[PDB]
Design a protein around this ligand. Sequence first.
Ligand SMILES: [Ca+2]
Ligand SMILES: [Ca+2]
Ligand SMILES: [Ca+2]
Ligand SMILES: [Ca+2]
Ligand SMILES: [Ca+2]
Ligand SMILES: [Ca+2]
Ligand SMILES: [Ca+2]
Length: 389
Amino acid sequence: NTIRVIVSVDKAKFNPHEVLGIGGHIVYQFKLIPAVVVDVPANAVGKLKKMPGVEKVEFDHQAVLLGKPSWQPAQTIPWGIERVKAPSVWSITDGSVSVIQVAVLDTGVDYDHPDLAANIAWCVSTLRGKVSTKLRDCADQNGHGTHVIGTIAALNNDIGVVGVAPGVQIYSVRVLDARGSGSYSDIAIGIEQAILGPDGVADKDGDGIIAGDPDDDAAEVISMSLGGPADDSYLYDMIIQAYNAGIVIVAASGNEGAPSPSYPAAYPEVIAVGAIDSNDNIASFSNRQPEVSAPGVDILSTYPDDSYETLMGTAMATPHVSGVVALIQAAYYQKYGKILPVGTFDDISKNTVRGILHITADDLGPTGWDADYGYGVVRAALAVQAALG
Ligand SMILES: [Ca+2]
Ligand SMILES: [Ca+2]
Ligand SMILES: [Ca+2]
Ligand SMILES: [Ca+2]
Ligand SMILES: [Ca+2]
Ligand SMILES: [Ca+2]
Ligand SMILES: [Ca+2]
């Protein structure tokens, strides 16, 4: 009965052979942070902590999906896509700018869904600490991933639905199992994979440009429709690698009606996303103090197997924002041959992605940022306009 823990280490002194020596093993060595996921006897963690080079031993917490199913063959435009004013942007860009990819860390994807396939660029899985690019492993066993993905990127054609950014390339990174449950360790490995991309190297040409570099295959957005209450240092360390790579990170605020967002949404470097309904009210389940809000009730999208389904949750709101991000970056790159900086929470200018989102958002409720809606409901068209402005 080994348990899985995540060790933060000093690479000069940590000796993995010591871990094998007490009956453990290394499951995954992070490429971008100094840490290793290890399996070891519970009764032997006492020892691990004492080994040379072991700075911290964190247990493997759990996060869960933040969407649930709610209780025409020709294409429907789901109401939320219209709410966030995406279709008007498509004349400028549908997100099909070659350097732009959106990584969706979720339950996997129905990679061959006729309304998604053309936009699935890379389908990968990190479950149990093993990185697999086998399609069987990257397929969705829950449906939630396929639905989230569809809200970002379902194709604009004569069937099904249509995403916020219906031409954007998607990386499906499976970090959640069939029940929508995920280990923090897998989720961290998944954020790492979104950075590394298909070629396995963060900055291949070593110019210090990752996101926005056409010579690399890093994602530009990481979208996490999932959350947990634990705040673990190695996971935050990974979020910072991604942020430092120029990648915009977006995550669901959570659904317990709690006064603040779950993790990773609650990190400063992450855009926490709250849920509204078709009446512009905040849903009661929506965790407070989000950064922005978006449609998250009665959301129709793609679902396995080659089907459609209506779900609800902050998980559903999240992809609407990620899709807006993808339109911003795509239109800005299309015009300027570069992307914009990610920005911070406080940001109120047009020179960062986050500043654009905050200043163009539809400010419902009490004037300015407020604990229900954040800065407001994201608006694609106005955002792209500020971007190109
Ligand atoms: Ca890219
Ligand atoms: Ca469609
Ligand atoms: Ca790469
Ligand atoms: Ca580079
Ligand atoms: Ca380059
Ligand atoms: Ca299918
Ligand atoms: Ca407000």
